[PDB]
PDB file of C-alpha atoms in Angstrom:
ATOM      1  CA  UNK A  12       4.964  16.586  16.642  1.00  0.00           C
ATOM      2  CA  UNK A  13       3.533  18.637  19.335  1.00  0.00           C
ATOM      3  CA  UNK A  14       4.142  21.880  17.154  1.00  0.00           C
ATOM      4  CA  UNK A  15       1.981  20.208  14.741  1.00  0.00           C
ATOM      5  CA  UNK A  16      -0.809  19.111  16.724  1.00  0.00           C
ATOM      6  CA  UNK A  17      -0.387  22.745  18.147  1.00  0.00           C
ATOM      7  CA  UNK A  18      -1.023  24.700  15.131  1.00  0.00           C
ATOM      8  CA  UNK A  19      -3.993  21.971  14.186  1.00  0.00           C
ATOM      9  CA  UNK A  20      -5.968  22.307  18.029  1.00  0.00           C
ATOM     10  CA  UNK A  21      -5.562  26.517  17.223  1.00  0.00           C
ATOM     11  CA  UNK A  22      -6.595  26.012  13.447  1.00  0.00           C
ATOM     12  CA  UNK A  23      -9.723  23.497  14.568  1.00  0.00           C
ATOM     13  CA  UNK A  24     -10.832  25.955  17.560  1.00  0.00           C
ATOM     14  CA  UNK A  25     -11.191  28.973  15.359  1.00  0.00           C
ATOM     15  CA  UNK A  26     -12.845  26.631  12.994  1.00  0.00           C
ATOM     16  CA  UNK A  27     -14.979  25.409  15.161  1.00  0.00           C
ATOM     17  CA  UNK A  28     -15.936  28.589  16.388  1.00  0.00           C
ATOM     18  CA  UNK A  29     -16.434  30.024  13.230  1.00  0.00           C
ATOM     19  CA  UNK A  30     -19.254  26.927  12.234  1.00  0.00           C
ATOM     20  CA  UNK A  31     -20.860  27.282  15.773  1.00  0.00           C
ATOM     21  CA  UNK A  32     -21.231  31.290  14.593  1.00  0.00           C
ATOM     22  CA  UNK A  33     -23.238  29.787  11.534  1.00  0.00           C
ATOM     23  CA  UNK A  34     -20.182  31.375   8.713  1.00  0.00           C
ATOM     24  CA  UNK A  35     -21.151  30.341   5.409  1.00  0.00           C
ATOM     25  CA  UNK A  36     -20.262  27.007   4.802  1.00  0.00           C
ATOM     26  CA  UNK A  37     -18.165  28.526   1.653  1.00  0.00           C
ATOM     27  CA  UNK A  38     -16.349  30.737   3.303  1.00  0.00           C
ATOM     28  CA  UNK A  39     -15.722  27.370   5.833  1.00  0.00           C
ATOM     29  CA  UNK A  40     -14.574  25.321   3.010  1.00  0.00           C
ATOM     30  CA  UNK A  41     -12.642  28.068   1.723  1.00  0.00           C
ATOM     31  CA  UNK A  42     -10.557  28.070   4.768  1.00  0.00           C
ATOM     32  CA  UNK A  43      -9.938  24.434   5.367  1.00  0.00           C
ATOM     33  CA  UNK A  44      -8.319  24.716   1.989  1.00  0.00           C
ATOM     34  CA  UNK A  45      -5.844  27.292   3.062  1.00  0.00           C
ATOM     35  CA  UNK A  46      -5.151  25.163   6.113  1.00  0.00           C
ATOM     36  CA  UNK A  47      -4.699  22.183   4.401  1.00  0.00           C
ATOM     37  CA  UNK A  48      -2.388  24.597   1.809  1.00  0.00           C
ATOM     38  CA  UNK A  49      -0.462  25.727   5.285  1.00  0.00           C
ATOM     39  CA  UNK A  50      -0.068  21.779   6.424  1.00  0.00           C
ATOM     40  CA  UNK A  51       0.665  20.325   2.794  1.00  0.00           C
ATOM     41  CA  UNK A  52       3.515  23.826   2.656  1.00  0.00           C
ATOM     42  CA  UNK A  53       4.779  22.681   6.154  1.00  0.00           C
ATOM     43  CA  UNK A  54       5.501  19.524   5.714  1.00  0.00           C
ATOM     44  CA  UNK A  55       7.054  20.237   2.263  1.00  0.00           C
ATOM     45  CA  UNK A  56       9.448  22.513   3.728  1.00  0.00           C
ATOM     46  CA  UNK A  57      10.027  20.030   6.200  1.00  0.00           C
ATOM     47  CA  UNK A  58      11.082  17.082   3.661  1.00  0.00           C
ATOM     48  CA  UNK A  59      13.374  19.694   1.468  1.00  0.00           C
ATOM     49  CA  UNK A  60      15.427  20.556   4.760  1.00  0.00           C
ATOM     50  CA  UNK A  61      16.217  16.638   5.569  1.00  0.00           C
ATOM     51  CA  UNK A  62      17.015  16.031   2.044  1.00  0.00           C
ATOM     52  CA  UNK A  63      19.428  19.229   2.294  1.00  0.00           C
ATOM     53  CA  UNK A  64      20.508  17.578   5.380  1.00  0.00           C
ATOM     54  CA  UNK A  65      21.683  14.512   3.611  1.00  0.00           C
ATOM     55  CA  UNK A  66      23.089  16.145   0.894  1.00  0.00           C
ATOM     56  CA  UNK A  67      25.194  18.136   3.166  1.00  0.00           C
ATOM     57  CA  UNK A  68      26.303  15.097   5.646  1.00  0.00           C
ATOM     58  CA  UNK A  69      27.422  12.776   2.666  1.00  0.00           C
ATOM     59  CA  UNK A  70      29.474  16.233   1.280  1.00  0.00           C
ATOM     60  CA  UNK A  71      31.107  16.557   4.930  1.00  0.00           C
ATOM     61  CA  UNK A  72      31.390  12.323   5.260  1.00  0.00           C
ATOM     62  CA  UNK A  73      33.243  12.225   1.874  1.00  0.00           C
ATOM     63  CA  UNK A  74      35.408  15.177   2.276  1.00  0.00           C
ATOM     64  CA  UNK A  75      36.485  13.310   5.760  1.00  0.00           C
ATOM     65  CA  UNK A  76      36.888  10.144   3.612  1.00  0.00           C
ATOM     66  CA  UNK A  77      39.157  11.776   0.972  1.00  0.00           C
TER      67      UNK A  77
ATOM     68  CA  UNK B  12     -10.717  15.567 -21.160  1.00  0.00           C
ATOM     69  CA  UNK B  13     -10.427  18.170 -18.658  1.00  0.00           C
ATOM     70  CA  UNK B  14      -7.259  20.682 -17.717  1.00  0.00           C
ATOM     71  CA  UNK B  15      -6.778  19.097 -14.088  1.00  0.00           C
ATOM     72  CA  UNK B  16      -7.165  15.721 -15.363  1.00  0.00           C
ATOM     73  CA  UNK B  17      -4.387  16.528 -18.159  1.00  0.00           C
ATOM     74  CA  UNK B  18      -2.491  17.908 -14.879  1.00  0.00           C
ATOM     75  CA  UNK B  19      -3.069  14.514 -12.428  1.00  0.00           C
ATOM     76  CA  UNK B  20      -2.126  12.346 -15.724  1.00  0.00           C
ATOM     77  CA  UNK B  21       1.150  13.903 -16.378  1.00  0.00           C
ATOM     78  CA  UNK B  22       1.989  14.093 -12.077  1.00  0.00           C
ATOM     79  CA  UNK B  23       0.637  10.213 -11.861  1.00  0.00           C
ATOM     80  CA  UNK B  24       2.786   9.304 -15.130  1.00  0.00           C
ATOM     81  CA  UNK B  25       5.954  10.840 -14.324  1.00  0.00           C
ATOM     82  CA  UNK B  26       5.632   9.761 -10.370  1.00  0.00           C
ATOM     83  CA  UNK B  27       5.113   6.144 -12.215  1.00  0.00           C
ATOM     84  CA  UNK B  28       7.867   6.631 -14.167  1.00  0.00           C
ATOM     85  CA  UNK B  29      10.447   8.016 -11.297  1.00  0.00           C
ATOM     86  CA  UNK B  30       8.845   4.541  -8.990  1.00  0.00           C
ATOM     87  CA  UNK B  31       9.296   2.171 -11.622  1.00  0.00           C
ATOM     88  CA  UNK B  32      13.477   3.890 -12.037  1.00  0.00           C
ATOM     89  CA  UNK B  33      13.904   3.392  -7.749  1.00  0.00           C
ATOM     90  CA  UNK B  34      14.108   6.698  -7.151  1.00  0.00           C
ATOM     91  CA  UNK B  35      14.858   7.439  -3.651  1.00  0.00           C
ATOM     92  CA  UNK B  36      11.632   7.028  -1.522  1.00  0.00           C
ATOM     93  CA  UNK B  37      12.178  10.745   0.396  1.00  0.00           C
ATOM     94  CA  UNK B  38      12.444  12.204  -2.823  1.00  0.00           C
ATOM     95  CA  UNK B  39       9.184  10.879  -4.038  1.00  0.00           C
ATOM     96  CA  UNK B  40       7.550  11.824  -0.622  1.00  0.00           C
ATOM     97  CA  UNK B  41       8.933  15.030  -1.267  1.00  0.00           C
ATOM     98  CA  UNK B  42       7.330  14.995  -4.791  1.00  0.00           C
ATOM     99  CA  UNK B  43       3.692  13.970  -3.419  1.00  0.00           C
ATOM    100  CA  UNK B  44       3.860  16.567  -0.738  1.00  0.00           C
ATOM    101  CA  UNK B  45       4.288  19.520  -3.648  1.00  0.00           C
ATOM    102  CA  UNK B  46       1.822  18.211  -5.813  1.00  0.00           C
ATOM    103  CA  UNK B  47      -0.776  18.381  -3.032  1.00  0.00           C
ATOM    104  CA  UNK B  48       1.237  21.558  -2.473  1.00  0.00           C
ATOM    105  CA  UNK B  49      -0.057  22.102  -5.815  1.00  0.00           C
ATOM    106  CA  UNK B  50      -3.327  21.012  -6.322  1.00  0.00           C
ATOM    107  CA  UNK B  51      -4.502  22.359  -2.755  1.00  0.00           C
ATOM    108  CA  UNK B  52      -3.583  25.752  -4.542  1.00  0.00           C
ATOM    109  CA  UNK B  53      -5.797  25.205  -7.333  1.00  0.00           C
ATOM    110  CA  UNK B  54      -8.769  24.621  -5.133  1.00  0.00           C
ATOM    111  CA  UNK B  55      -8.260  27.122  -3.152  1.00  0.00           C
ATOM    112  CA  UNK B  56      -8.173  29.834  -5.639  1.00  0.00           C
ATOM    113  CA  UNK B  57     -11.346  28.679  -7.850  1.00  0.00           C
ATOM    114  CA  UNK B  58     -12.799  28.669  -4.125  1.00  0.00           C
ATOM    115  CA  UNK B  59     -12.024  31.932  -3.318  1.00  0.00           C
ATOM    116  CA  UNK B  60     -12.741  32.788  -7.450  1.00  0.00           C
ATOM    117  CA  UNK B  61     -16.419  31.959  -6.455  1.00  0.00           C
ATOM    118  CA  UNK B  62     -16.525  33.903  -3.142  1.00  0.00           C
ATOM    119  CA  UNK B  63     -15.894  36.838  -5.030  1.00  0.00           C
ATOM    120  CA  UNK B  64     -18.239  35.936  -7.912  1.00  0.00           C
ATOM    121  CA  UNK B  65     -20.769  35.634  -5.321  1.00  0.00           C
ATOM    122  CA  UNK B  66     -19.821  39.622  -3.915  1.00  0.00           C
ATOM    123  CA  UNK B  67     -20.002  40.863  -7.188  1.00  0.00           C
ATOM    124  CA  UNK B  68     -23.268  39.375  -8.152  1.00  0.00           C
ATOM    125  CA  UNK B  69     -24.591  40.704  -5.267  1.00  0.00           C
ATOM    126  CA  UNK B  70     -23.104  44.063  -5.564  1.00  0.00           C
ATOM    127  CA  UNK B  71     -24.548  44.237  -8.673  1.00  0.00           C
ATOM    128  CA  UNK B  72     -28.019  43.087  -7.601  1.00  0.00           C
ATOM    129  CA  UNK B  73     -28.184  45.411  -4.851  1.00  0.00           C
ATOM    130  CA  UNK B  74     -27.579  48.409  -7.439  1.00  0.00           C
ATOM    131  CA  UNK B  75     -30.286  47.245  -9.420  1.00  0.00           C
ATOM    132  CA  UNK B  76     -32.615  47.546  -6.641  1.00  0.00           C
ATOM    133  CA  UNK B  77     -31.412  50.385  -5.034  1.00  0.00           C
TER     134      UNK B  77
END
């Protein structure tokens, strides 16, 4: 997610108001490549922390285990 | 033969490579995610490259006619 689909309804309402304003369609595509930068960056993070997370169980698991 | 496409070939051929070994499926995820990451970045800077091509043309114009 709801965070997600947060940040995308705030990201598409600006965007949206932004076209409906008639903003260069450059500067428009310009932005929905930082957005999909933001996402892509997001989700990244994301997959790092729940490999750390693994990493870090299996450390604790074995160190319980010997 | 372009730059990007030397870029994609190398990502595509090592990704290939690290599939074809069984590397774990998160870390490839996580390996997709930053070269999106990656090319997204690309993009975005030629885009905003042009944007200020495009300011500086017509700053330049403008003088002329002034």
């Amino acid at each position: 997610a709801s965070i997600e689909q947060l940040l995308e309804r705030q990201w598409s309402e600006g965007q949206q108001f932004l076209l409906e304003q008639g903003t260069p369609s450059d500067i428009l595509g310009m932005l929905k490549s930082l957005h999909q930068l933001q996402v892509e960056n997001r989700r990244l993070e994301e997959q790092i922390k729940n490999l750390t997370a693994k990493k870090e169980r299996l450390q604790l698991l074995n160190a319980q285990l010997s």
